[model samples]
Target: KDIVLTQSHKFMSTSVGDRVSITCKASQDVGTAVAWYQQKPGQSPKLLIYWASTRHTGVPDRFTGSGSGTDFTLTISNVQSEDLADYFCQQYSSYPLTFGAGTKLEQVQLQESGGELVRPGASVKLSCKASGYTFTSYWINWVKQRPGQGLEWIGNIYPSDSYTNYNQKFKDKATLTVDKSSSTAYMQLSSLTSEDSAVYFCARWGYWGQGTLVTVS
Candidate 1:
């Protein structure tokens, strides 16, 4: 986790009667654990949202902080020229929320053989490749979708045989392997069912991949 602050504009050319909104996003959904600050060049930074999205006394109604996850934000609602100083978003000194990268999401791009053409009782492989953040820092969770349906957790996997927990439904049907060097995860589904003829995705911290659909004809 890192403290990534992406302001609406590095330079604002607004007056006292304008409205301003800045946004900060987390790869993971860290609701109220976020905070924002205002640093007037060299003076010091002030804590507007001390915790995630909670605001208390001392500040005026104009200087209000509101938003879900609000993840903690300081909306100088009706922007005041007095508030036109330097703005900064933060998490902590020892740590932050997400790295500077914005937590990108990419589908397993190649081999991306769409819709597997196989028999009723054959086998197939699905992959979810990724970038952004380190591969080993987090484990990959898998989920599959039956046509026209919601997501079904394929359970979770460990890079090696260190730690894991998979859906009992897949205990004897799927294999999860991690190719750390390439930052990719592999899922081998055997004894394909029309049940297996569905879309698959790579998951983490609420983020997901889009290229794991296996088609059995």
Candidate 2:
């Protein structure tokens, strides 16, 4: 006889400052349950939303969330400079919790474009190469780093299946593609500008590469 099994589900790449939201459907009902995270440019990621819609310990009130029956939304009332990185939504209702790709908010300045600028129409390609474990079995996640902040989850690629998850905010702003044949993951920022000056990194779980800096001037 055969038995039916249920699994977790997810959606990714919601835009920043645009009513960021996501849905996670389970085989069965999961009562009030979920979490959210924010990863800035240089630092490690942190928990922002948790236990359905309640803020995590020490999290600010500016960040609020609400949802039920596998549907949820995480909103940052006012997107601030500190919040201009990547945002992620996660579900803890089941084992092996999952995360959304991430949403990135851009910031502008009046300073002159420096050597960091990659002329418009040009391409800035960065990569994350994996070692240690079987690269094909684990997920390779790429993130962007602001000049003086922590990491912001951009998206993740499953080398084994070539599946991808992107932060909603970067839906159309970033191009997250990969080459499994090369055991490398890539993040290509097109139409580069001075604001795109930042560091990029590739990771699996908590393991990360040294990271590369890319300037778009």
Candidate 3:
């Protein structure tokens, strides 16, 4: 028998101070076993909510979740600076676990002075080359690592199909495309600016690359 995969949607997005909602449809029912994770720069990804509404042992009370069956919602009462990172929902109920692309909460703008223009349409390429496993069989995702902040998921690429999913909030701010023929992943940031400065990473759901640092001078 061949393994079958099913995805509800390609991408989902949310903004700062807004509620984010996403659902993952398994090929079969998965009950109420789900987990949520947050990824920040220079830090390991942390588990926020797990087991569909029961916060992790050390998680704060502000983060609440409620859902059943194949639908769920992970809500943070008031989005904070620490919350301004990428948020993902996962299901450990089944084998070959999966993660939602991710929701990034960001500050409206960066506060900096006397910085030179990084120029618009300046091309920068970052790669998440796969090793130890087959790249074509799984998903490779890209995220933004903001200074003094957390990881913001930009989008993900299906190496097998070369298809992509992007955060609607980053519709114009990010470009999540891929090249599977070379077995390499790419992310291009046009209109480079101080605000665009961040370390971009390539990931396989839970596993991540060393990350490439790109600064806008």
Candidate 4:
């Protein structure tokens, strides 16, 4: 058995100058050991809260954290347009740190190419087109999720220099590339099999596109 954290919502919507609270509940008592991160489009996740209720250094005052035991909450006051991003809560109280699925405070645009139905031993390339921000200034990351499994990191590439970092397990199975001119990122998966069938996502820090399903039959 494994410990799990549940987010109250997968998505949340709020207007400028509003107040919103995101909740994270641990499967068992974790006391005040939760941390929160904020991710923006094409950027990396930034720590916002740690030790459950303490704001990280340099974090804005509008963002506050409070809770204990198994329940935790992150509240944002006077939320601005810039507050549109994804919020994730992680529990560090036990071995095998666990994280909440994530809650998105919406705003941004990312479109993933269509799904693919390919045969075993074949290959497919997926694309993510981004807009509303400077693409070359950030890194584009890829993730995988099997039919009922959790998210798995594939790799990421910096659009400006083509520098990349990959998960060793997926290093040989996936190739990451980017087209700076079109503000697009691509992931090519080769030697497909039933085990490779899953939905893939292209993400920028806090923003993610609708997933592209890949079915290897």
Compared with the true structure, all predictions reach lDDT values of 0.56, 0.59, 0.61, 0.82
Sorted on lDDT, highest at the top, how do the candidates line up?
A: 4, 3, 2, 1
Worst 10 residues of 1 by lDDT: 99-108
Give Cα distance to truth, residue 172, candidate 4, Å: 0.8
As a TM-score, model 1 comes out at 0.48
Better of 3 and 4 by TM-score: 4
Top model number, TM-score: 4
Off by over 4 Å in 1: 1-115, 160-162
lDDT of 3 by residue, 10-73 (tens): 3444455665554444445557777677766465466777777888767877688777667777
**lDDT score at residue 178, model 3, on the 0-100 scale:** 52
Number of the top lDDT candidate = 4
Residue pairs in steric clash, candidate 1?
Answer: 1-97, 2-97, 2-98, 32-52, 116-215
TM-score against native, each model = 0.48, 0.48, 0.50, 0.59
- lDDT of model 3 at residue 108? 13
Better of 3 and 4 by lDDT: 4
Could you give candidate 1's per-residue lDDT for residues 86-122 as a string of tens digits?
Answer: 5555443222122121111112222223346768788
- C-alpha lDDT of residue 35 in model 1: 52
| Clash pairs, model 3 backbone | 40-151, 121-191
